[PDB]
Amino acid sequence: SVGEDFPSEYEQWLPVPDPESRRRAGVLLHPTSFRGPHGIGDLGEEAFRFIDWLHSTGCSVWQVLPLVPPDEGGSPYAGQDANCGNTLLISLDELVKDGLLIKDELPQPIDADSVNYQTANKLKSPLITKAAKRLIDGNGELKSKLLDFRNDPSISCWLEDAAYFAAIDNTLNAYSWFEWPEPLKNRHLSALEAIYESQKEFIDLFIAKQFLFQRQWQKVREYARRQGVDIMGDMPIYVGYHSADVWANKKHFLLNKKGFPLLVSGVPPDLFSETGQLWGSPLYDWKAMESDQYSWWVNRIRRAQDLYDECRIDHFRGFAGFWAVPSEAKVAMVGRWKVGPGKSLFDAISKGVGKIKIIAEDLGVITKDVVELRKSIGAPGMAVLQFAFGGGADNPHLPHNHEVNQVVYSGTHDNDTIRGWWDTLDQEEKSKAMKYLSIAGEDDISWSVIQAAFSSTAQTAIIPMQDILGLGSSARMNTPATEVGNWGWRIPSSTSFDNLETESDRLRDLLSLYGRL
Template sequence: MISNHSSLFNKDCGLLMHPSSLPNRFGIGDFGPSATQWLELLASSGQSLWQILPLNPAGYGDSPYQGLSAFAANPVYLSPEALHAIDLISDYELRVLEIEPNDQVDFTSVYECKAEMVVWAAQRFFEWDTAHPLREKFNRFVHDEGEWLEDFAIYSALKQHHGMRAWTEWPKEFRDRDAVALRHFSVEYAKDINRVRFEQFFLAEQWATVRETAQRFNIRIVGDLPIFVAHDSADVWCQPNLFRLNSDGSPTVVAGVPPDYFSETGQLWGNPLYAWEVHRADGFAWWRKRLRKILDWVDVVRIDHFRGFDACWEIPGDAETAIDGHWIDAPGREVFEKFVEDFGLPLPVIAEDLGVITPEVVALRDDFHLPGIRIEQFAFGSDEMKSTFLPETYGPDCVAYTGTHDNDTVVGWFNSSAGGSTTRSQQEVDAERAETLAYFGTDGSEIHQDFINRLYQSEAGATIVPVQDLLGLGSEARMNTPGVASGSWRWRLTRFDALVTAFEALAVLTKHCQRGSMAGKGAAVNA
């Protein structure tokens, strides 16, 4: 057990909203002025945390948890306004990129518009004098990030060239990374490859401005690191030896979870499992680089499916559901010992410790003093562990949520019926609703506020509320439904002024509960 540590959180609080959900006139939130405005709103209400989802390029189903790279960022977050401010796109082009405001992202339209924007902007950028400060900074970026950037740029260009098909479906010479074939391709498609470098450079530049703004407001950004990477990713294509694959590149076994609250057949994620013996041989270098990279972008990282570091659900590569899987051990303790060597204590890591949690998983979390998470929605119903999710049980060693991106909104959950996205019967749904009303002692007309009030009054080290719950939105605003292949990740806010009243109330609650930037300022009272 590791000792001599300090706590990662001290009555912090904040909101969960992915950059894609930020309002602007370009169809999807980005790293531009809307992110700055969002941080100003957070600061005005005393919040100290902004939690986001993975920023990696989204793959299958537009899911940020099926990223095309564990190291790159998603080019849809490039801000047209920021590029316009440095004359890389024109006034006319800025108007052309506008998309009618909607509370659902149309990813097809967004991808097309952003791709066109990059063509315009990159052409102008590479026409600038090579002595221009940004051109020189770009060259340094390409050099410093080359270990992952070059492979990702070639992978991205190859994927475009092959109609976005998975790398296992490319011609054999590209699938197997034949050096001569890749060299010829890199020469022929140099402009496409350079555009990918351009995207990643300006994503880093724009996000650096966001980080500086957050630091000025004393707001920490909480990122998200999926434990597994997508099979169709630059990571697996470049280093297949790190994963358990067949000779044709297909996965021998894949990841998922057994049947649970969200699905009667479990969840078949399809991510290849790690060849842990290969990782162990070089001191888990890939994992250490991965954590270091995300901590270049965020202040704290939530590790999704943390229990996979102790053991993961192994499913045959050709299985159609997750039912036929079994648990296999993973060397999480060795990995986290390396993390401590690199980053010290307290590790800036939150352990997403939901699902099938064994004493071994708890020991791994606690021995490295990682805060776990608690979901207030899970405090009601028939689950035998529900008492551990009651707000009065939260302590300084946990991060508490009304719900996460995987949950329905509080209002949607409270008003739900049997079927749909739940495995509960109508009798169970009705019993949960009655139990919830009895617990809060209200009529449920402001159930989202009941949840938020009780959450902030708890002793949790940090509390985080999805912005949909702050606004009291229903199931139409749910971010993700686990196990459903399409239609998720699309919700977005259409205008900031919809938040004004909610943020005023949140500021009062935050001060009353002495959380966030209000911590220690005056006596706490019941909100």
């Protein structure tokens, strides 16, 4: 105590940085974008080569979009199921390594500069099915793992429903489950038993395909972990109407007596559309969900825990307040803001799954409740440099207004590439940006913005692969409020991870400089 002598080497009693505060960087790249011969990226060789490339840069995070079966436009954010994997990500070459295909069965390569889901489906699906058929017919080690997977209660609580939904959908010629006969529509037990008898093989194959996705995704994840790379997944806030999630959990969505949505999702007039984004997903009956401690949402997060080290929460503002549009409407601009579940949801998640690493996508209309909700759960938010040059110096996306507990992006999958953005940028905004940023040639504008993200105080900086490749507007992943021509971008067939040492070295130099290695 006060006045007395210290021990010796008091001089070596120095502050030790907290390992959870470690500065880092990463790349945003959806696996559909990998090059290869089967019309779409997959969880095979290119994923592992990408991980190796990423590791060589010093980056320690890979962010993907939702891995759910996408809508027919390719959107991960209107998925056909909330928990299933997109089976067209399954690598045929990896099935050959597993003994479920032979090399001779692999199709002839097709050129596909961009992903066409219908072309990839026709090519891959017969061989995926044939591999699943060999799996369920076999009686050894892999079959034994299939059975563990399917009897595991944290799988079967969603996978059984998904497989029955898919089987009924295969049985019926109908637009959606709204049109289904009453016993199937409302999941009468003897109807489900009848479906099990008449569709037994389809059900066993669907389940086998989910196992194969799981298996291959987990190999990619462990390989990333072996190379010092965390994977950040993405949890879309809404699911599509035509899904097992809505059909099997009707009471938990805002549907009428006949199962039709009263209200659908979106946002009011914004940057991307002067009539708003009319997403058109069904909405959650949050009060009903509260009555069984949000178990559907809890199950979702438990699933995400199993796939990802960390998870982005899409449209995070929607848990404080959400935009609700009448279901008959043709534009989002007529609508009401409604009260979200708030912290009560995250308390339920904590109680059910324990410790989670979540990233709030807090972009959009950010009201006081949104900020307070984010702070109350300790989650980092986002900054996007492409938004930084409207308004004045109080713009939160400007570097000097960044926070430590935050993730900085050059842009997301919703934004144009940096070059594309620069190219159409308003002159007032462009002249601003020239003052803040360190710009050499306009060819390398993407690198100027990348450097600005890396120089930030934000703990994590994430760059889309398109910007590392210096690509233009044609490489944009998604344009919000458009219905066609999205989610198709692929790494050009000529660009290999072997041909990107210059880019790797340049990233590593910037990470070294800004203490992100």
